[PDB]
Design a protein around this ligand. Structure first.
Ligand SMILES: Nc1ncnc2c1ncn2[C@@H]1O[C@H](COP(=O)(O)OP(=O)(O)OP(=O)(O)O)[C@@H](O)[C@H]1O
Lengths: 119, 119, 340, 214, 59, 132, 116, 85
């Protein structure tokens, strides 16, 4: 981890782009966000909208990491992210994907997060 | 009763019966309250809650927690005090005058203070 | 779900529906079935096989026996054995349904094998990789690409809960794996709700993406009516102090509930299930007495098997609802409600 | 203190809270229904009580006490509070005979004074009370009790001061003997030859009973 | 007629009058408030000074 | 007051309550009494019959099951009674007469039933004048 | 139903659902008493306890415990007995006259016995 | 105790709650049973208490309805009185 001297000593607000997030629960630039809620609520739609809002707003990129992700649902996610344009197979995809699938031993799934971290 | 005297045993027996009755009724008090009691049960709960505050006793050691002088209350006076309470001679006196008190004469004194001050 | 709640019967009649296509010819609409008995008794398995013979389900049945007589590694390997069996069909561009029944005994067997092999136990003496067990199992069922040939393996695992608990380690693992639950309750079965489905918990993350569109275009209201009704149905144990909105909600909820009671070994075609839902949603049953509903239904079926059979074949062939289908359907609906 | 005990108990209390919530909603519906009957009884009664404001029927100098609850309970400090008002007024005149309307106030009063109770009315609190019922019971009072013989009549009801408050309340009834004896009475023109006080007292009894019940 | 001597009280006289009026109802217009208004369901029980009991009769 | 405050009150629905009115017409103990905008404070028991309420508007025709008319001395006449009634729709001859014959039969019973059934025959025959 | 007879199956099913509704209503009556129910609800509670104590059956083995000789109750008596109880023919008979009883004729015998 | 109750020829159970309610000894009738029971009981004692235990069981059963504090008929009130005595 970065040293204590390298810590930025005041967390500004990461301007997302979404009204409710930027209004009620503002995100720290470099902070931790606990997203709740089951599937079927457009949670994937929410996070793709976050990807586009960061790409337009700040220009930084997105790294998605499915630790123990359902491989069928990972496929549907990848297909949608192609279709919603955050993945452009020929142009500039704005995101990097790491999918530690469920069928991988626990030695994989306790390191998929660190892989996406290092990326 | 052949050790502490019969009357002491009887008084303590009735006290434990009253408080066991209160602890049994505690859940219905928690849901419904004292209004949904029978009047004998309501009188018993009233007397038991008088007894509970009467149990508390000012300590000379914990005077720094109270500002109240300690009460070295004799045995026979305590027996006659609980006797008169089980007889209900002081049911007119409210519950708060029983709290953190010495003998029953001190309950009379505290009830006099509450009558002269709360008015 | 918990024990002895027709989970086996649910999967059994699920297999028994496939006479409707396996007697046909379209393999892309056919469906081969593999039942996997694990940790059970031989008499139950033979009774099941005899029952499949009673409907000629052994035309397309494959039975894998992992009974409690057998050794523990047999019970361990039998789900993966049938998984390879199903993958054979899956890589033929075909359609295979497998039913694991159960996985709880299989987890117990693997626990026994690992504990006697002196591997360090975890929570409730289970091994660590037991989740890794089932995740390596259930991901073998999939739906393939047109590049591959679009084979499909579909899995129906069975979890025997204890005391109606999902917080137990193996059910929590399987719930974390699967694509949603078909949850059952004992109490509804003791209210005679057969099958005893708690609709308030049973979900599908796939859901409406793979439903029949004729069923889809009427089914969306039904979920709303039941979601309304479950909030309200505690009012039913009181007097008539309800407004006609909530009393209408009780009427619809009880009558749609009485629709969903049905017998074991009663597979109903989708062309049969659609008009029942159309009539139950659209208030046509509200005047009908609560007891007669199930036979009403039956007579209703015969009515549509007397007079509007071509409409039913059109429902089955298209899988959608034409406006003419809705019109003639409500016509026959009000007609039979009038003559009942 | 097992998981089983705490689980079953918590499920029981969840069922209890669900049932109390449904009971509160049904109580709100019945309260909204009963306010119509309360207002329609009150506005009828005020047309006769404004007369008693004008015709000052204020009596002078054995007593009849009537209390009003229902058969059911589950309404908190009502059955004991109204019985405590009965206690207040009955310590004044212990000879005063009692006719209860309501099983629960009857059980409140029969434990403390079984002597004065001589008539009990049952089958009440299921519905909003009607004038058929109230006039019928008022007929029964001049049939088995003969309250016109009684000098002083008190009606004990419960006044909802708010939806969150209440009051056990007393209403005096003046007999028809007092009605001719009233000072502000010859102001009102009345036929001597029509028994108008001796029927208007019955009408007063019926209306005040209906108002007390509703 | 001679209800004052033989029959009812005047409140009960008008009660029987209301029962006859609502008994002379239009059956289209005879609502549930009318029948519940005549739903005579009160039970009277004459007690005694020793708190004895009479019949809970339908009034 | 100019006009009068009518308080026409019932146990189920008090219809008029200080409604400004020119004339009331009511069957009381002394017969049909018409009272205008002013009157002596006067208390009357009301026989079951036809009340005609004339206002600044026309005169409405109701039936009454008896009650009390009391002139509050501010010229507020309070009719306190039980039954309201439409023009003639609530009145039905087959309902009245078939019950009236049975009520004449019950008038032959014991005096508790006989006096009440005689009252009911009287009321139905007064309602025959409402059938008119 | 195809094994034990359709009618017997339906009788057992209605008994099952009756007892389930009883066990369901056990939360209210323990707290809010019998009074809050409907009349059909209280009828169902009554008939459910009727069926419940009608399941009681003396045992010749347990005759040293009860002092009551055992009843060997046949199937076809049992079917018609629960049939009549589900039809409510004996709702007038109190529930106490069902305790530790054999057939419905013995029900009638105990009911007439409890007249004293 | 789950091992031991599986062994013995009956059990005697002694809730302290009853001991605080003056019941000395504090015998829970509803749980303390004898697997042998009456077969070794004194027969004169048997003849006078041939139905006493189940009577107290149904006394405590019906007595739970009186804990709600509703009115009950004189049959059940009589059994309440006799079981209380
Ligand atoms: N729709 C239904 N119609 C009739 N009977 C049913 C229905 N559903 C379930 N049952 C009955 O419920 C009982 C239990 O069913 P089943 O034996 O399949 O449970 P299960 O799924 O095998 O669970 P377990 O393996 O724990 O026994 C069966 O005897 C069956 O007859």
């Amino acid at each position: 981890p970065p040293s204590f001297a390298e810590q930025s000593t005041s967390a500004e607000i990461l301007e997302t782009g979404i009204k409710v997030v930027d209004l009620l629960a503002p995100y720290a630039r470099g902070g931790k966000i606990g997203l709740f809620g089951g599937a079927g609520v457009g949670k994937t739609v929410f996070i793709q909208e976050l990807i586009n809002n960061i790409a337009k707003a700040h220009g930084g990129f997105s790294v998605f990491t499915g630790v123990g992700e359902r491989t069928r649902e990972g496929n549907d996610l990848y297909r949608e992210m192609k279709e919603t344009g955050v993945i452009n197979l020929e142009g500039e995809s704005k995101v990097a994907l790491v999918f530690g699938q469920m069928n991988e031993p626990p030695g994989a799934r306790a390191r998929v997060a660190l892989t996406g971290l290092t990326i | 009763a052949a050790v502490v005297g019969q009357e002491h045993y009887d008084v303590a027996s009735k006290v434990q019966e009253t408080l066991q009755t209160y602890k049994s009724l505690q859940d219905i008090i928690a849901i419904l309250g004292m209004d949904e009691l029978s009047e004998q049960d309501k009188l018993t709960v009233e007397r038991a809650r008088k007894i509970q505050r009467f149990l508390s006793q000012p300590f000379a050691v914990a005077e720094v927690f109270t500002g109240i002088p300690g009460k070295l209350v004799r045995l026979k006076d305590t027996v006659a005090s609980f006797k008169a309470v089980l007889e209900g001679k002081y049911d007119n006196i409210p519950e708060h005058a029983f709290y953190m008190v010495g003998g029953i004469e001190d309950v009379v004194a505290k009830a006099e203070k509450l009558a002269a001050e709360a008015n | 779900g918990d024990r002895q709640t027709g989970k086996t019967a649910v999967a059994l009649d699920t297999i028994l529906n496939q006479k409707r296509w396996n007697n046909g010819s379209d393999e892309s609409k056919k469906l081969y079935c593999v039942y996997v008995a694990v940790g059970q008794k031989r008499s139950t398995v033979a009774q099941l096989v005899q029952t499949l013979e009673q409907h000629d389900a052994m035309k397309y049945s494959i039975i894998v026996a992992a009974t409690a007589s057998e050794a523990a590694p047999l019970q361990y390997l039998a789900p993966f054995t049938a998984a390879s069996i199903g993958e054979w069909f899956r890589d033929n561009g075909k359609h295979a349904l497998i039913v694991y029944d159960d996985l709880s005994k299989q987890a117990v067997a693997y626990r026994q094998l690992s504990l006697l092999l002196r591997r360090p136990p975890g929570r409730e003496a289970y091994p660590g990789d037991v989740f890794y067990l089932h995740s390596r199992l259930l991901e073998r069922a999939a739906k393939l690409s047109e590049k591959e040939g679009s084979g499909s393996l579909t899995a129906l695992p069975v979890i025997e809960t204890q005391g109606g608990d999902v917080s137990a380690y193996i059910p929590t693992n399987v719930i974390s794996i699967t694509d949603g639950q078909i949850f059952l309750e004992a109490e509804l079965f003791y209210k005679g709700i057969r099958p005893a489905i708690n609709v308030g918990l049973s979900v599908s993350r796939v859901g409406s993406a793979a439903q029949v569109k004729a069923l889809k275009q009427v089914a969306g209201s039904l979920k709303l009516f039941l979601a309304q009704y479950r909030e309200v149905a505690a009012f039913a144990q009181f007097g008539s102090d309800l407004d006609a909105s909530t009393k209408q909600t009780l009427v619809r909820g009880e009558r749609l509930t009485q629709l969903l009671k049905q017998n074991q070994y009663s597979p109903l075609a989708t062309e049969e299930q659609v008009p029942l839902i159309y009539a139950g949603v659209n208030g046509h049953l509200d005047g009908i007495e609560l007891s007669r509903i199930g036979e009403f239904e039956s007579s209703f079926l015969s009515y549509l098997k007397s007079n509007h059979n071509e409409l039913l074949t059109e429902i089955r062939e298209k899988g959608e609802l034409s406006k003419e289908l809705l019109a003639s359907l409500k016509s026959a609906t009000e007609s039979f409600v009038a003559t009942f | 203190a097992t998981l089983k005990e705490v689980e079953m108990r918590l499920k029981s209390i969840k069922n209890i809270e669900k049932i109390t919530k449904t009971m509160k909603i049904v109580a709100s519906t019945r309260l909204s229904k009963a306010e119509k009957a309360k207002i329609s009884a009150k506005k009828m009664d005020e047309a006769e009580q404004l007369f008693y404001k004008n015709a000052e029927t204020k009596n002078l100098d054995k007593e009849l006490i009537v209390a009003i609850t229902s058969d059911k309970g589950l309404c908190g400090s009502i059955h004991s509070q109204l019985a405590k008002a009965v206690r207040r007024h009955l310590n004044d005149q212990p000879n005063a005979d009692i006719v209860t309307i309501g099983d629960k106030i009857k059980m409140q009063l029969l434990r403390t004074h079984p002597n004065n109770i001589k008539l009990s009315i049952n089958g009440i609190g299921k519905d909003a009370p009607t004038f058929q019922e109230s006039a019928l019971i008022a007929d029964k009072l001049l049939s088995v009790m003969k309250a016109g013989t009684y000098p002083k009549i008190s009606i004990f009801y419960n006044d909802p001061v708010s939806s969150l408050s209440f009051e056990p309340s007393e209403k005096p009834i003046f007999n028809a003997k007092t009605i001719e004896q009233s000072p502000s009475f010859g102001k009102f023109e009345i036929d001597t030859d029509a028994n108008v006080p001796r029927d208007l007292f019955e009408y007063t009894l019926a209306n005040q009973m209906l108002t007390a019940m509703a | 007629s001679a209800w004052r001597k033989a029959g009812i009280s005047y409140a009960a006289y008008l009660n029987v009058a209301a029962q006859a009026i609502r008994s002379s109802l239009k059956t289209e217009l005879q609502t549930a408030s009318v029948l519940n208004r005549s739903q005579t369901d009160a039970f009277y029980t004459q007690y005694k000074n020793g708190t004895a009991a009479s019949e809970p009769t339908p009034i | 007051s100019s006009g009068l405050k009518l308080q026409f009150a019932l146990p189920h629905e008090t219809l008029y309550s200080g409604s400004e009115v020119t004339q009331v017409n009511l069957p009381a103990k002394s017969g049909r009494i018409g009272v205008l905008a002013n009157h002596v404070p006067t208390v009357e028991q009301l026989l079951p019959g036809v009340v005609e309420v004339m206002e600044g508007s026309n005169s409405k025709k109701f039936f009454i099951s008896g009650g009390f008319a009391t002139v509050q001395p501010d010229s507020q006449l309070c009719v306190t009674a039980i039954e309201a009634f439409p023009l003639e729709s609530f009145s039905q001859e087959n309902i009245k007469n078939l019950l009236a014959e049975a009520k004449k039969n019950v008038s032959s019973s014991d005096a508790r039933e006989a006096a009440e059934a005689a009252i009911q025959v009287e009321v139905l025959e007064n309602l025959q004048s409402v059938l008119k």
